[model samples]
Target: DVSGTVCLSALPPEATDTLNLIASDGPFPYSQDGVVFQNRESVLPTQSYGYYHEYTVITPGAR
Candidate 1:
């Protein structure tokens, strides 16, 4: 996975906090939501970064 090659030494504090929350039975606030771009090399539809707002939704029964 991409994470396997990622350098955690410089991981941002907010990302770390979010990850910890997910691992500790969290219901993260919508405000923590972020995005990832799909147009890596301009081969897809051109859109601004704000066009996407991604977040996670955890099922209530998941454990």
Candidate 2:
């Protein structure tokens, strides 16, 4: 049961695999190769003890 904002922290571990973070204005910073890694702090809303997800950082991607 989630008791906070609907964020990446709430997403299921699997979902994090293809996670793509979106910013307020647009996408996040890009990498040198021009291939920005997906993932960023989420400001979205989470269900009030209704629904929630789990995330696991198996292999941390480049920031």
Candidate 3:
């Protein structure tokens, strides 16, 4: 099993929202309902900190 945290401790006010859906493993199931605004503002300055949900996965290694 392997798991860790992905801390985005530097995001803008709008991008710092807790509803971010950054995939880290399996396919994420969801739907965008016209309120989506995609941008690369998180890699800029004056951005606050945002944290995503941590996760872990385990599988057989003797394949």
The number of the candidate with the highest TM-score is 1
- Ranking by lDDT, best first? 1, 2, 3
Give one digit per residue, the lDDT tens place, for model 1 in 1-63.
122456656755566666776576566666555556455676555788666445555444553
Quantify all predictions' global Cα lDDT against the true fold: 0.58, 0.40, 0.35
Clashes of 2: 5
> lDDT tens digits, residues 1-63, model 2?
336567777765744543544213224343322233332334435334424433333344633
- Which sequence of candidate numbers ranks them by TM-score, best first? 1, 2, 3
Clashes of each: 0, 5, 2
Candidate 1 vs candidate 3, TM-score winner: 1
Give each prediction's root-mean-square deviation over alpha carbons: 11.0, 12.6, 14.9
Model 3, 1-63: lDDT tens digits are 224455666533433332343433334332332233433454333333333233222223521
Better of 2 and 3 by lDDT: 2
TM-score between candidate 3 and the true structure: 0.16
TM-score of 1: 0.37
